[PDB]
């Protein structure tokens, strides 16, 4: 797995709160980042996961964590989806579009015969290092409060080396 490796450079368009923006790896430097992958806009499993993250987003921002959802759809499609799902509408973090699949392949997370990203979540520290990975099949929902726990634990070990907190 990619655990404990440094993330790779990327440049992508995103939709974020009514605005189109660009995102590169430089935007993640010095920050905690969550890269939240999912297969496709306008499907019926992803949104509750995405919505669950949206619910915890104010908390993540207070922890200094940025969230980037990623799929191989375009940022245009993201804006449309955001306009038409009540669940997606409550997303205020960056929805990155990855139509070239470069970001997705950076994380070794492409279904090559589908052109869609696997349902994988990556936690990345200020120095670019991946510290937690979660990948599930469709229907095995990713729980955002567990994600929150892992990040507080990651942040804690970063602040107290030599000491660690297990299960």
79-98 binders of a second copy (CB under 8 A): 79-81, 84, 98
Instruction: Identify which of residues 74 and 136 has a Cβ nearer to Cl ion in the complex.
Output: 136
Q: Which two tokens stand for residue 78?
A: 């993201």
User: Distance (Å, rounded) from C-alpha 36 to C-alpha 34?
Assistant: 6
From 19, 62, 86, 137, residue interacting with a second copy (rule: CB under 8 A): 137
Contact 68, 36 (CB under 8 A): yes
Q: How far is the CB of 61 from a second copy (least distance, A)?
A: 20
Phi, psi torsion values for 149, nearest 5 degrees: -60, -50
Which stretch of DSSP H or E encloses residue 96? strand 94-97
Q: How far is the CB of 114 from Cl ion (least distance, A)?
A: 17
Total Cβ atoms within 10 A of residue 121 = 22
Q: How many residues bind a second copy (CB under 8 A)?
A: 67
Q: How far is the CB of 66 from a second copy (least distance, A)?
A: 18
Q: How far is the CB of 1 from Cl ion (least distance, A)?
A: 3
The answer to whether 69 contacts a second copy (rule: CB under 8 A) is no
User: Distance (Å, rounded) from C-alpha 119 to C-alpha 110?
Assistant: 10
Of all residues in the shown chain, the one whose CB is closest to K ion is 99
β-pair partners for 71: 97
User: Distance (Å, rounded) from C-alpha 31 to C-alpha 21?
Assistant: 18
1-20 binders of Cl ion (CB under 5 A): 1-2
Q: Which residues are catalytic?
A: 46
User: Distance (Å, rounded) from C-alpha 7 to C-alpha 75?
Assistant: 22
Residues of this chain that bind a second copy (CB under 8 A): 1, 3-4, 40-49, 51-52, 72-74, 76-77, 79-81, 84, 98-101, 108-109, 111-116, 118-120, 131-146, 149-150, 153-154, 156-158, 163-167
Residues of this chain that bind Cl ion (CB under 5 A): 1-2
């Amino acid at each position: 797995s990619l655990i404990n490796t440094k993330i790779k450079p990327f440049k992508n368009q995103a939709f974020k709160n009514g605005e189109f923006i660009e995102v590169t790896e430089k935007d993640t430097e010095g920050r905690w980042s969550v890269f939240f992958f999912y297969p496709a806009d306008f499907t019926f499993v992803c949104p509750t996961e995405l919505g669950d993250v949206a619910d915890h987003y104010e908390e993540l921002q207070k922890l200094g964590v940025d969230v980037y959802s990623v799929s191989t759809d375009t940022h245009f499609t993201h804006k449309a989806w955001h306009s038409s799902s009540e669940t997606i509408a409550k997303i205020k973090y960056a929805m990155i579009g990855d139509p070239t699949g470069a970001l997705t392949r950076n994380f070794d997370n492409m279904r090559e015969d589908e052109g869609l990203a696997d349902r994988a979540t990556f936690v990345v520290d200020p120095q670019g290092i991946i510290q937690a990975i979660e990948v599930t099949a469709e229907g095995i929902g990713r729980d955002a409060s567990d994600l929150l726990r892992k990040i507080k634990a990651a942040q804690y070990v970063a602040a107290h080396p030599g000491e660690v907190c297990p299960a």
